[PDB]
Amino acid sequence: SMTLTLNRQLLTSRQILVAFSGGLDSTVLLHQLVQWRTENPGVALRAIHVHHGLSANADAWVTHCENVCQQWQVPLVVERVQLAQEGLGIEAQARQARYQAFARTLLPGEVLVTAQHLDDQCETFLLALKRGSGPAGLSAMAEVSEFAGTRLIRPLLARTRGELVQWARQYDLRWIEDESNQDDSYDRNFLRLRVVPLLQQRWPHFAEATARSAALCAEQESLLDELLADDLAHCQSPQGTLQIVPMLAMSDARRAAIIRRWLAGQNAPMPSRDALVRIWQEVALAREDASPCLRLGAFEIRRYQSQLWWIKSVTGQSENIVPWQTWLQPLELPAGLGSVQLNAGGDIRPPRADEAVSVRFKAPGLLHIVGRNGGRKLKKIWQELGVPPWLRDTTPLLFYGETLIAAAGVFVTQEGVAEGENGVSFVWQKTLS
Amino acid sequence: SMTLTLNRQLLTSRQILVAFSGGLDSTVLLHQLVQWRTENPGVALRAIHVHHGLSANADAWVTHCENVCQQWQVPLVVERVQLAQEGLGIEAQARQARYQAFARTLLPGEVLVTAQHLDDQCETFLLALKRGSGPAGLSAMAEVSEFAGTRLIRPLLARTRGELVQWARQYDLRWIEDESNQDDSYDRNFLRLRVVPLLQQRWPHFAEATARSAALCAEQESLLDELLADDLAHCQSPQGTLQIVPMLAMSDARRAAIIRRWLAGQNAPMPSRDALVRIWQEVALAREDASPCLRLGAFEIRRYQSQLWWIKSVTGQSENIVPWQTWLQPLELPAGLGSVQLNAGGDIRPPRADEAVSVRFKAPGLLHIVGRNGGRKLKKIWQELGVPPWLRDTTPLLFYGETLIAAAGVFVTQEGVAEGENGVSFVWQKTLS
């Protein structure tokens, strides 16, 4: 039935790439896939062993993987990524390097498949538990998730190590397995060896019961997904923000479940239940006048126009002034804001080779712009044009000497309009995400 | 703050009864209550030690409890309930006897209070987990629940054993504590001593994280409570049944959450997620023609009139015939169906001292009843009158010789109508629930 199970989960896939450590689970997953390939002509399969850290057999494991793949006619990428600096041990440092390694060496349209099984579901659950997470975090792992643009499928997720042993053995597969005892100071190890077994003693199927609970938590979260759909549709704008007004009346749990689901949409890192609390109390209910902001890692959620925004944090630049001596060539902007350049053809007057061109993010005094008869301050103009506060000091400002010419993609001052009709275009380019 | 916490949870209470084993938690809870009484004049407090099983100090513990209560001026009920027959050990047999003991010795209007703390929340969670239960069952314990008509409050539910030790010690309270090592074959013991501690090693606050998860599961179930309210109102009749038709269109999770919440309303034992599945697939979607029935312990859920019913199972009696030689005196019915009697005054003709009166639950041939011009079979009459199938063979039928006179509270045959106007009343009495 593991083969039966395999094809159902892999129907929507043609190109697979399996994380292949010499181990049982990988060995059983891979043998099954090579078994699967022989049954579906035209199906391409690739394997990838990730050699990381200074293991005693780190080099031998690689060799073992090269023989098995070849004996089975399967290409094999072998990333040697290395990283460890006294910080977060194996159960963190490496896991990232590995998934990055998977990300790196993964073709487009190819589906990443891992050999994570029941015991891992139990371990994930426990770790979530020891973190005091709710139903969302206790749903542990999904049979199908999104990873590096594509999907990450986990077939053997429901299978027991017993089942895997019974298979790997029935087909006389040879596999490695260095328990690495002394890694007991790294959470996921301390479980499989000490806690979990201790549990399987009086409760032989403990790990099975846990997947059951995980599954039930998931069913409930999806029930809420259904139940909240409308609420979400209404409060979620097309832009990708969340309308505050429609929520002012809701209950704390309602709000949190929505904020939660909304943050998931931006494919954001799962928030802590208290984070969800702060977001509403300190941001949504905060005065827009006082620029509300909750830092959540590299990202930040804030309030603007009675809406909550999930955006990639970026450091201000109001005090910066980046000179453009060679404005004939693009100018690289600070804090990865991208490049900027003056192309022939546009409503902005070119600079004289005698004046000093520069890029800034601030501009004093009353300012006059095209399309408005008046003259207000930068901040007033920003507001009238709807430019969000986090962008009011991160938007390129063209300056010839001490004069403001334009604000990339937002406006052009009147003192900067093309005299004749020729003129140039101040163009702003941002790097890939 | 434990005192602060105490009064908030006990405001809606005047008469308390604390399950008092000599232990820390009880000792700390009780001392705090005697502390609480001194601060709220007119507040009555009672303690109850439950002596059960053949413990080495079973008798000494009692004595210790008698001294402490007296030293503190607190009445003390001491139930000696005993029960153990090789079946379900302490973590089952006794727990029932104890709560029964609590039930028995509890005054009306009095609130039962127990000294269950954080560690118990963790243990309850784990047990639920090892049972593979979902969010509803993983909410573990509530600060306030219903027990024997009244409420069961658990103040110290959030407090750590540490906190309790720090208190019992700060007020120099003396308490007992016989770990009873060899009870390790009884689930809740195997946890507190082996698993939990093993966990608190690498995770000192594991038990605290677990209450956090329990709490979050609860918040979500209440979120659903809110979200499903309307659905429940609509599908739940006034009688206390569940309308099937309005659910036919819903999704599996929706239905289950409703069936679940509905069963809770009848204050029924929490159902297994699969039970919820069977109920719908085997009962709701079953043909009423084929009398659908799912036995869930002493109770059973069934289908009648496009509705699901939660009712106290009762064995049929269609084959039974209980003679009434002394119809002048009440007749005790089988299978705790209650008693039955003929009172002077009613539309039924009395029996002659020459005919043989009896009670039955079946009746052959075409039958003629008052208020209908015709003559159909018992089963047809039952149907036309709306008598549920489980009651069609558990309803007393008056028989003089071989003639049907009446069906208690349902109908009177035409051959049994009072000749003149005097007549008697066939009255059916059922015992307390």
Coordinates of C-alpha atoms in Angstrom, one line a residue, chain B residues 9-381:
Chain B
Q9 CA -12.9 32.6 41.0
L10 CA -15.0 32.2 44.2
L11 CA -17.1 35.4 44.1
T12 CA -20.1 33.6 42.7
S13 CA -19.9 31.1 45.6
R14 CA -20.9 31.1 49.3
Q15 CA -20.6 27.5 50.3
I16 CA -17.5 25.6 49.5
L17 CA -16.6 21.9 49.9
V18 CA -12.9 21.1 49.2
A19 CA -11.7 17.6 48.3
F20 CA -9.1 17.4 51.0
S21 CA -6.4 14.7 50.9
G22 CA -3.6 15.4 53.3
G23 CA -1.4 16.5 50.4
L24 CA 0.3 19.8 49.5
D25 CA -2.1 21.1 46.9
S26 CA -5.1 20.3 49.1
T27 CA -3.3 21.7 52.2
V28 CA -2.4 24.9 50.3
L29 CA -5.9 25.2 48.8
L30 CA -7.6 24.6 52.1
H31 CA -5.4 26.9 54.2
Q32 CA -6.1 29.6 51.5
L33 CA -9.8 29.0 51.9
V34 CA -9.7 29.2 55.7
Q35 CA -7.8 32.4 55.0
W36 CA -10.5 33.4 52.5
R37 CA -13.3 32.7 55.0
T38 CA -11.7 35.0 57.6
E39 CA -12.0 37.7 55.0
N40 CA -15.6 37.1 53.9
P41 CA -17.9 36.7 57.0
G42 CA -20.9 34.4 56.5
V43 CA -19.0 32.2 54.0
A44 CA -19.3 28.6 55.0
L45 CA -16.6 26.1 54.2
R46 CA -16.5 22.3 54.4
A47 CA -13.7 19.7 53.7
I48 CA -14.0 16.1 52.7
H49 CA -11.3 13.4 52.9
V50 CA -12.1 10.3 50.9
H51 CA -10.6 7.2 52.4
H52 CA -10.4 4.5 49.8
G53 CA -8.5 1.3 49.1
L54 CA -6.1 -0.5 51.4
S55 CA -3.2 1.9 51.8
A56 CA -0.5 1.5 54.3
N57 CA -1.4 4.8 56.0
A58 CA -5.0 5.0 54.7
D59 CA -6.0 5.3 58.3
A60 CA -3.3 7.7 59.4
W61 CA -4.0 10.1 56.5
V62 CA -7.6 10.3 57.8
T63 CA -6.3 11.2 61.3
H64 CA -4.0 13.8 59.9
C65 CA -6.9 15.4 58.1
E66 CA -9.0 15.4 61.2
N67 CA -6.3 17.3 63.1
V68 CA -5.7 20.0 60.5
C69 CA -9.4 20.7 59.9
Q70 CA -10.0 21.0 63.6
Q71 CA -6.9 23.1 64.2
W72 CA -8.5 25.2 61.5
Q73 CA -12.1 25.0 62.6
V74 CA -13.5 23.3 59.5
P75 CA -16.2 20.5 59.4
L76 CA -14.8 17.4 57.8
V77 CA -16.8 14.6 56.1
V78 CA -14.8 11.4 55.8
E79 CA -16.2 9.0 53.2
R80 CA -14.6 5.5 53.4
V81 CA -15.8 4.2 50.1
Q82 CA -14.0 1.0 48.9
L83 CA -13.9 -0.6 45.5
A84 CA -11.4 -2.6 43.5
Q85 CA -11.9 -5.8 41.5
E86 CA -8.9 -6.5 39.2
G87 CA -10.5 -4.3 36.6
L88 CA -9.5 -0.6 36.0
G89 CA -7.0 0.3 38.7
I90 CA -6.7 3.5 40.8
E91 CA -6.7 5.9 37.8
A92 CA -10.3 4.8 37.1
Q93 CA -12.0 2.7 39.8
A94 CA -11.2 5.1 42.6
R95 CA -11.6 8.3 40.7
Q96 CA -15.2 7.4 40.1
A97 CA -15.8 6.4 43.7
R98 CA -14.2 9.6 44.9
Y99 CA -16.3 11.9 42.6
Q100 CA -19.3 9.8 43.6
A101 CA -18.3 10.4 47.2
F102 CA -18.1 14.1 46.4
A103 CA -21.5 13.9 44.8
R104 CA -23.0 12.0 47.7
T105 CA -21.7 14.3 50.5
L106 CA -22.4 17.6 48.8
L107 CA -25.0 20.1 50.0
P108 CA -27.3 22.0 47.6
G109 CA -25.9 25.4 46.6
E110 CA -22.4 24.3 47.8
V111 CA -19.6 24.6 45.3
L112 CA -17.1 21.7 45.0
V113 CA -13.5 22.9 44.9
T114 CA -10.5 20.7 44.1
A115 CA -6.7 21.3 44.3
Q116 CA -5.7 20.3 40.8
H117 CA -2.8 22.3 39.5
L118 CA -0.5 22.9 36.5
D119 CA 1.1 19.5 36.6
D120 CA -2.4 18.0 36.4
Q121 CA -3.1 20.1 33.3
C122 CA 0.0 18.6 31.7
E123 CA -0.9 15.1 32.7
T124 CA -4.5 15.5 31.4
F125 CA -3.1 16.9 28.2
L126 CA -0.7 14.0 27.7
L127 CA -3.3 11.5 28.4
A128 CA -5.6 13.1 25.9
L129 CA -2.7 13.1 23.5
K130 CA -1.9 9.4 24.0
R131 CA -5.5 8.9 23.1
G132 CA -5.0 10.9 19.9
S133 CA -7.7 13.4 20.7
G134 CA -8.3 16.6 18.9
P135 CA -8.5 20.2 20.2
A136 CA -11.8 19.6 22.1
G137 CA -10.2 16.8 24.1
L138 CA -6.9 18.6 24.4
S139 CA -8.4 21.6 26.1
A140 CA -7.8 19.3 29.2
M141 CA -9.4 21.0 32.2
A142 CA -11.6 24.1 32.8
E143 CA -11.4 26.5 35.7
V144 CA -15.2 26.0 36.1
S145 CA -17.2 22.9 35.1
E146 CA -20.6 21.4 36.0
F147 CA -20.6 18.6 38.5
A148 CA -23.6 16.9 40.3
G149 CA -26.0 19.7 39.6
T150 CA -23.5 22.3 40.8
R151 CA -20.1 23.7 39.7
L152 CA -16.7 22.2 40.2
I153 CA -14.1 25.1 40.6
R154 CA -10.3 24.5 40.3
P155 CA -8.4 27.6 41.5
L156 CA -4.8 26.4 41.6
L157 CA -5.1 25.1 38.0
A158 CA -2.5 27.6 36.7
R159 CA -0.2 27.5 39.7
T160 CA 3.1 25.4 39.6
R161 CA 4.0 22.9 42.2
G162 CA 6.9 25.2 42.9
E163 CA 4.4 28.1 43.7
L164 CA 2.4 25.8 45.9
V165 CA 5.6 24.6 47.8
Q166 CA 6.7 28.2 48.2
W167 CA 3.3 29.0 49.8
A168 CA 2.7 25.9 52.0
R169 CA 6.2 26.6 53.2
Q170 CA 5.8 30.3 53.8
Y171 CA 3.0 29.6 56.2
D172 CA 4.6 26.6 57.8
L173 CA 1.9 24.2 56.7
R174 CA 2.5 20.5 57.4
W175 CA 1.3 18.1 54.7
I176 CA 1.7 14.4 53.7
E177 CA 2.8 12.9 50.4
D178 CA 3.3 9.2 49.7
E179 CA 4.4 9.0 46.0
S180 CA 3.4 5.3 45.9
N181 CA 6.1 4.4 43.4
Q182 CA 4.8 1.0 42.3
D183 CA 1.6 2.6 41.0
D184 CA 3.8 3.4 37.9
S185 CA 1.6 0.9 35.9
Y186 CA -1.3 3.4 36.2
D187 CA -0.9 6.1 33.5
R188 CA -1.1 9.3 35.5
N189 CA 1.6 8.1 37.8
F190 CA 4.0 6.9 35.0
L191 CA 3.8 10.5 33.8
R192 CA 4.5 12.7 36.8
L193 CA 7.4 10.5 37.8
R194 CA 9.0 9.3 34.6
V195 CA 7.9 11.2 31.4
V196 CA 7.1 14.7 32.7
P197 CA 10.3 15.0 34.8
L198 CA 12.3 13.6 31.9
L199 CA 10.8 16.5 30.0
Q200 CA 11.3 19.2 32.6
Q201 CA 15.0 18.3 32.3
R202 CA 15.7 19.9 28.9
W203 CA 12.5 21.9 29.2
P204 CA 12.0 23.1 32.8
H205 CA 8.7 24.8 32.1
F206 CA 7.3 22.0 29.9
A207 CA 4.2 21.7 32.0
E208 CA 3.6 25.4 31.7
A209 CA 3.8 25.3 27.9
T210 CA 1.2 22.5 27.9
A211 CA -1.4 24.5 29.8
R212 CA -0.7 27.2 27.3
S213 CA -1.5 24.8 24.4
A214 CA -4.6 23.5 26.3
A215 CA -5.8 27.1 26.7
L216 CA -5.3 27.8 23.0
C217 CA -7.2 24.7 22.0
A218 CA -10.0 25.9 24.3
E219 CA -10.0 29.4 22.8
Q220 CA -10.4 27.9 19.3
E221 CA -13.3 25.7 20.4
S222 CA -15.0 28.7 21.8
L223 CA -14.3 30.6 18.6
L224 CA -16.1 27.8 16.8
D225 CA -18.9 28.0 19.4
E226 CA -19.3 31.6 18.4
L227 CA -19.0 30.9 14.7
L228 CA -21.5 28.0 14.7
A229 CA -24.1 29.5 17.0
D230 CA -26.6 30.2 14.2
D231 CA -26.1 26.8 12.6
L232 CA -26.7 25.3 16.0
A233 CA -29.8 27.4 16.7
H234 CA -31.3 26.4 13.4
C235 CA -30.6 22.7 13.4
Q236 CA -31.3 22.2 17.1
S237 CA -35.0 21.8 17.8
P238 CA -36.8 22.9 21.0
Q239 CA -37.3 19.2 21.9
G240 CA -33.6 18.7 22.0
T241 CA -33.0 16.9 18.8
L242 CA -31.0 17.8 15.7
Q243 CA -32.6 18.5 12.3
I244 CA -31.0 16.4 9.7
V245 CA -32.2 18.1 6.5
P246 CA -30.4 21.5 7.2
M247 CA -27.2 19.6 7.5
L248 CA -27.4 17.4 4.4
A249 CA -25.6 20.2 2.6
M250 CA -22.8 20.9 5.1
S251 CA -19.3 19.6 5.1
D252 CA -18.0 16.8 7.2
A253 CA -16.2 19.1 9.7
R254 CA -19.1 21.4 10.0
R255 CA -21.5 18.5 10.7
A256 CA -19.1 16.9 13.3
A257 CA -18.5 20.2 15.1
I258 CA -22.3 20.6 15.3
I259 CA -23.1 17.0 16.3
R260 CA -20.4 17.4 18.8
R261 CA -21.7 20.6 20.3
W262 CA -25.3 19.1 20.2
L263 CA -24.2 16.0 22.1
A264 CA -22.6 18.4 24.7
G265 CA -25.9 20.0 25.2
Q266 CA -27.5 16.8 26.3
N267 CA -24.6 16.8 28.7
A268 CA -23.4 13.6 27.0
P269 CA -20.0 11.9 27.2
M270 CA -17.6 13.4 24.8
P271 CA -17.7 11.3 21.5
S272 CA -14.8 10.0 19.6
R273 CA -14.2 11.7 16.3
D274 CA -15.0 8.5 14.6
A275 CA -18.1 8.1 16.6
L276 CA -19.1 11.5 15.1
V277 CA -18.4 10.0 11.7
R278 CA -20.5 6.9 12.3
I279 CA -23.5 8.9 13.7
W280 CA -23.9 10.7 10.4
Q281 CA -23.0 7.9 7.9
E282 CA -24.9 5.1 9.8
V283 CA -27.7 7.0 11.4
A284 CA -28.6 10.3 9.8
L285 CA -28.1 8.9 6.3
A286 CA -29.8 5.6 7.3
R287 CA -33.4 4.8 6.2
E288 CA -35.9 5.6 8.9
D289 CA -37.7 2.6 7.6
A290 CA -34.9 0.4 8.9
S291 CA -34.8 1.9 12.5
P292 CA -31.2 3.4 12.6
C293 CA -29.3 3.1 15.9
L294 CA -25.8 3.7 17.2
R295 CA -25.1 2.5 20.8
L296 CA -22.9 4.8 22.7
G297 CA -22.7 3.2 26.2
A298 CA -25.9 3.3 28.2
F299 CA -27.1 5.8 25.7
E300 CA -28.0 5.6 22.0
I301 CA -28.5 8.1 19.2
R302 CA -31.1 7.3 16.5
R303 CA -33.2 8.7 13.7
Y304 CA -36.8 9.6 13.7
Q305 CA -38.8 12.2 11.8
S306 CA -35.6 13.4 10.0
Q307 CA -34.0 14.1 13.4
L308 CA -31.3 12.7 15.5
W309 CA -32.2 11.8 19.1
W310 CA -30.0 11.3 22.1
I311 CA -31.8 9.0 24.4
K312 CA -31.3 6.7 27.4
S313 CA -31.1 3.2 26.0
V314 CA -33.8 0.8 27.2
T315 CA -34.4 -2.9 26.4
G316 CA -37.5 -3.9 24.5
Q317 CA -40.5 -5.6 26.1
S318 CA -42.7 -6.7 23.2
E319 CA -42.5 -10.3 24.4
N320 CA -43.2 -9.4 28.0
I321 CA -46.5 -9.8 29.8
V322 CA -46.6 -8.7 33.4
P323 CA -49.9 -9.9 35.1
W324 CA -51.8 -7.5 37.5
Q325 CA -53.6 -9.8 39.9
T326 CA -53.9 -6.9 42.4
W327 CA -54.7 -4.0 40.1
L328 CA -56.1 -2.2 43.2
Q329 CA -52.4 -1.7 44.0
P330 CA -49.7 -0.2 41.7
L331 CA -47.7 -2.6 39.4
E332 CA -44.0 -2.3 39.2
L333 CA -42.9 -2.5 35.6
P334 CA -39.8 -4.4 34.2
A335 CA -36.5 -2.8 33.1
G336 CA -37.0 0.2 35.4
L337 CA -39.9 1.5 33.3
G338 CA -41.6 2.7 36.4
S339 CA -44.9 1.8 38.1
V340 CA -48.4 1.9 36.7
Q341 CA -51.9 2.2 38.4
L342 CA -55.7 2.6 37.9
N343 CA -57.0 5.7 39.7
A344 CA -60.8 6.3 40.1
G345 CA -61.9 9.0 37.7
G346 CA -61.2 8.8 33.9
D347 CA -62.5 7.8 30.5
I348 CA -61.4 4.1 30.8
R349 CA -63.9 1.4 32.0
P350 CA -62.9 -0.3 35.2
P351 CA -62.0 -4.0 35.2
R352 CA -64.4 -6.6 36.7
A353 CA -63.1 -8.6 39.6
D354 CA -63.8 -11.6 37.4
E355 CA -61.4 -10.7 34.5
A356 CA -57.7 -11.0 34.3
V357 CA -55.9 -7.7 34.1
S358 CA -52.3 -7.5 32.7
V359 CA -49.8 -5.1 31.3
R360 CA -48.2 -5.8 27.9
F361 CA -46.2 -4.0 25.2
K362 CA -47.7 -5.6 22.0
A363 CA -51.2 -5.9 20.6
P364 CA -52.3 -8.0 17.5
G365 CA -54.9 -7.3 14.9
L366 CA -56.8 -4.2 13.7
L367 CA -57.3 -1.8 16.5
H368 CA -60.0 0.9 17.0
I369 CA -59.2 4.0 19.0
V370 CA -61.1 7.0 20.3
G371 CA -60.9 9.9 17.9
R372 CA -60.4 7.8 14.8
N373 CA -63.0 6.1 12.6
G374 CA -61.3 3.0 11.2
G375 CA -59.1 0.4 12.7
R376 CA -55.4 0.0 11.8
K377 CA -52.5 -2.0 13.3
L378 CA -50.6 -1.0 16.5
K379 CA -47.6 -0.1 14.4
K380 CA -49.7 2.1 12.1
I381 CA -51.3 3.8 15.1

